Design a protein around this ligand. Structure first.
Ligand code: HEM
Ligand code: HEM
Ligand code: HEM
Ligand code: HEM
Lengths: 146, 142, 142, 146
């Protein structure tokens, strides 16, 4: 992948503006509520009976923070994302067997959480750079056949 | 299938957005064209695809008109959107992947302007709504 | 939505298999487990996932037992598979991509035995049937 | 991707059993019939308005054959599929914007066409290797982010 300057700086700017714990937790909660079959991957993560239960789950808040810091890792290694994610790819595919469409679902929840926070600053060109970044990330997390 | 709860929440949002509905559609479309340029092909026969152009503005109204019809026909989306299904799924042969693309851009725009409306629970109903619109629109594929 | 033609092609196929349904269920579940091991996680509570073993056999039955029921209730799959949807989508949180995988392996097993029945138009009807089965099974997710 | 000797031998003998014109034509016709939106990608291919029109269209027959010969390039180069498909990826993604779900739909049609021809010889083990091959081809045809 080849980053333009706008893409590179948009990505750094977006993350510089995010509370990783706040955004992480909202994002993962959002995904387990809007797409409930994703709960099954997180079987030992406490109570997930209902919206309000997912919302007050300390473990889901903790893991949302982890996801966001995992993303920040790609932001710190923009030109080496595949390699940076090689171990994460193996976990999510070989051990956890996460169907790749779930990566897109979680990505979409993040975008909408980000959209609601940044408002008018989260423009089409900005969402463009953010989607390109998530696309690269999602591609690096999926099974590597090459 | 949309619950009574989901239908109440959809209608509620639709009331909140009336003043901006035309504009929501225009910008959502500009998002789709910029962020997912695989969709540009469907609309390249217009004169201009830029986020604020006359054709994007006009078509954005039209999309929101169709979604308004969806809201009117929420109790039976398959029956209610059939002419739009014949248009999108048969005549234009729109790849079903594209419907979820547009839905997502519409939610993104709605979130940027209406952040407080997007609780998890509300978002779930909105998503179920857009999913059911896409299934309705897919009726006439095959 | 399935046309009268689709329902007819599907009932005829099911009529043709009737004899070997348990066996077809057996081999098709064995294909899924081998060809798509991401599915093993759902059945790891057995102590033999290897195809040709009784758990695969006994479970292959009930799957085909589930489809003939589905065939019986083809006019309203939503209502006819409510309890199974509760079990799959709710309780077990089966990822929906998986319904597509099993459907595929069932068609493939059938293709190897009933090649003459797999004309393009008949395959389309089968695929609309399995898709509608998957959507009905998906009902109780959310 | 590490091919076992069985996987290599199987892919080779599947393809040695296929008439590229017959199987390729049937696969593509099957895809345009079972998943009719795929037609829009071949808009300049003639009468695609009916299943009987698609069946008897010689453009589809010609292009079906081309698909099988493109697959053959992966069969002859099983350890270098990504590089072999670099220009094909650019074509299908960058130029023609083919949604990647369609690669899998086509793959599934080919599978069902192969299953019907091969019969009992197309065992679960044989289908295992075939799908692994197709997974790798499909990944290679998709947009390359890395
Ligand atoms: C952009 C998408 C994602 C990113 C960046 C991400 C990142 C991470 C990271 C950094 C970890 C910690 C791994 C470790 O402990 O070494 C992790 C674990 C995990 N992830 Fe993801 N992840 C993503 C998507 C998903 C999705 C969509 C699912 C399922 C729906 C999922 C399920 C899991 C599970 C089950 C674990 C292990 C939890 C545990 O240790 O109990 N991940 N992920
Ligand atoms: C929320 C789902 C959608 C709704 C409710 C919707 C609604 C509508 C309506 C009401 C029209 C009438 C305009 C006419 O007759 O020309 C229309 C046209 C059209 N739609 Fe959609 N649409 C949706 C999704 C999509 C998607 C995803 C695409 C492709 C990426 C698409 C492509 C088109 C095209 C090309 C036209 C004709 C445009 C023109 O000629 O100006 N639509 N749509
Ligand atoms: C057309 C698709 C399917 C049909 C018709 C179907 C049908 C059935 C039936 C009739 C049962 C027995 C229920 C009972 O024991 O009370 C069952 C159980 C089960 N299914 Fe499915 N099923 C389908 C798809 C799937 C898929 C795709 C998966 C995941 C890979 C799955 C996982 C399970 C599991 C884990 C059980 C319980 C196993 C047990 O009690 O031994 N099912 N299904
Ligand atoms: C197994 C997956 C596929 C393989 C191996 C494959 C292979 C090929 C090859 C070898 C070509 C010729 C490129 C050249 O001229 O050098 C081609 C062209 C093309 N392919 Fe694919 N293809 C695949 C899937 C698909 C799918 C699913 C679609 C659409 C849904 C598609 C649409 C096209 C189109 C539109 C062309 C250009 C045809 C024209 O000249 O008008 N392909 N493909």
């Amino acid at each position: 992948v080849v980053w333009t300057d706008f893409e590179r700086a948009t990505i750094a700017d977006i993350f510089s503006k995010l509370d990783y714990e706040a955004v992480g937790g909202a994002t993962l909660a959002r995904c387990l509520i809007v797409y409930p079959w994703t709960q099954r991957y997180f079987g030992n993560f406490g109570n997930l009976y209902n919206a309000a239960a997912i919302m007050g789950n300390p473990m889901i808040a903790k893991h949302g923070t982890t996801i966001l810091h995992g993303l920040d890792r790609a932001v710190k290694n923009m030109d080496n994302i595949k390699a940076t994610y090689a171990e994460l790819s193996v976990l999510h595919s070989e051990k956890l067997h996460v169907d790749p469409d779930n990566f897109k679902l979680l990505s979409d929840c993040l975008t909408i959480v980000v959209a609601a926070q940044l408002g008018k600053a989260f423009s089409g060109e900005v969402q463009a750079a953010f989607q390109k970044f998530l696309s690269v990330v999602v591609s690096a997390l999926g099974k590597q056949y090459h | 299938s949309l619950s009574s709860k989901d239908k109440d929440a959809v209608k509620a949002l639709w009331g909140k957005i009336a003043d901006k509905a035309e504009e929501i559609g225009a910008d959502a479309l500009g998002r789709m064209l910029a962020v997912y340029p695989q969709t540009k092909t469907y609309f390249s026969h217009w004169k201009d695809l830029s986020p604020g152009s006359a054709p994007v503005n006009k078509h954005g109204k039209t999309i929101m008109g169709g979604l308004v019809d969806a809201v009117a026909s929420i109790d039976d989306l398959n029956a209610g959107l059939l002419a739009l299904s014949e248009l999108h799924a048969f005549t234009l042969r729109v790849d079903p992947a594209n419907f979820k693309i547009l839905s997502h851009c519409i939610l993104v725009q709605l979130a940027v302007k209406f952040p407080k409306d997007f609780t998890p629970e509300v978002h779930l109903s909105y998503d179920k709504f857009f999913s059911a619109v896409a299934r309705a629109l897919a009726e006439k594929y095959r």
